[PDB]
Design a protein around this nucleic acid. Structure first.
Length: 244
DNA sequence: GCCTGGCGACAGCCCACATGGCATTCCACTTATCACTGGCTTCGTCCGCG
């Protein structure tokens, strides 16, 4: 470990009284091979780093554990969860859990959250017990998740690009907060097939349901600043990208 | 006491429009400007003040 701890005991051993947190190494070493658990990302210059936790995705409880219904995927999951592996039925009832600690890479810290996948999503598939309405449920759910995330990144980059341009960002924080808060019930309406705006029950896919929520959150955030024509032109150039 | 009815006489009828018209040119700007600050850690050293 990069950190070295020593805990001074209480005489009974019931508690710790003092603690020493200090370095064990002066020279850092590259740890060989990427960590299976984390989700990685490559960025211009080609450097590979783990995707940071975001407390905005924790606003919608348990969104990361929906990772199973899926581009880039953690290797441990991609070895043990799929069908090349070896178990027979086990894979049907496995369910994913994630521990995320969103914080600064320095000493500031913001939020942590656990996230087990809901057992309702797979159990709603077995209530029926048919090959087709079930594969269609699973297809819908996987489809819903894909739409919500693609427009989550589209909306992050939208707000981020617009904020930088408008001043020649704080818009991203409220953008994502509003996004997942509004995008959470529309997802659960798409799964149950209940009627959600931007969606028609029984449609083959998400149906633009998600693209509408992103536009409403974005327009909710950039709303007071689309007044001046110069800034309004920038904001419009970047909301247009969320039109899909 | 409450409810209802009454208080000269006070006019009637007929009549009501057709037709026509309703504009057109031109002209619509430039320039300059567009903030800062911070909300990490512990410790050590230096400088200032008493």
């Amino acid at each position: 470990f990069r950190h070295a701890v020593l805990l001074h005991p209480s005489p009974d051993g019931s508690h710790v009284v003092d603690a020493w947190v200090t370095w064990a190494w002066r020279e850092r070493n590259i740890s060989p091979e990427l960590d299976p658990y984390l989700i990685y990302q490559t960025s211009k210059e080609g450097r590979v780093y783990p995707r940071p936790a975001e407390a905005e995705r924790a606003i919608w409880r348990d969104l990361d554990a929906l990772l199973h219904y899926g581009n880039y995927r953690p290797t441990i999951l991609d070895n043990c969860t799929p069908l090349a592996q070896v178990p027979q039925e086990v894979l049907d009832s496995l369910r994913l859990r994630a521990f995320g600690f969103d914080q600064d890479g320095q000493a500031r810290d913001k939020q942590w959250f656990t996230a087990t996948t809901p057992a309702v999503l797979r159990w709603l598939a077995d209530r029926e017990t048919d090959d087709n309405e079930n594969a269609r449920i699973v297809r819908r759910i996987t489809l819903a998740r894909k739409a919500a995330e693609a427009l989550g990144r589209r909306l992050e980059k939208a707000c981020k690009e617009a904020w930088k341009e408008s001043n020649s960002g704080p818009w991203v924080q409220h953008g994502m907060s509003r996004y997942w808060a509004k995008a959470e019930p529309v997802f659960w309406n798409i799964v149950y097939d209940r009627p959600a705006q931007g969606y028609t029950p029984g449609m083959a896919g998400p149906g633009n349901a998600f693209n509408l929520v992103a536009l409403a959150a974005y327009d909710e955030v950039t709303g007071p600043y689309c007044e001046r024509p110069r800034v309004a032109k920038v904001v419009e150039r970047h909301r247009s990208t969320l039109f899909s």
